[PDB]
Amino acid sequence: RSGGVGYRKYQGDALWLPNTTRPEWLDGSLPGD
């Protein structure tokens, strides 16, 4: 059982801005991305 309260899922990838896009040569295969 679960309940989403006190936080938000954000459906995303946690980039270094809250909303920008990913550069093309970087793909999420590496752990530090």
**What's the min distance (Å) between Cβ of 25 and another protein?**
16
| Binding residues for another protein restricted to 1-30, rule: CB under 8 A | 1-8, 10, 17-20
Q: Which residue is associated with the tokens 């909303």? A: 19
7 marked among binding-site residues: no
**What's the min distance (Å) between Cβ of 9 and another protein?**
8
Query: Nearest-5° angle of CA 16, CA 14, CA 9?
Result: 150
Query: In this structure, what is the dihedral angle of CA atoms 24, 16, 13, 26, given to the nearest 10 degrees?
Result: 20
Query: Which residues contact another protein by CB under 8 A?
Result: 1-8, 10, 17-20, 31-32
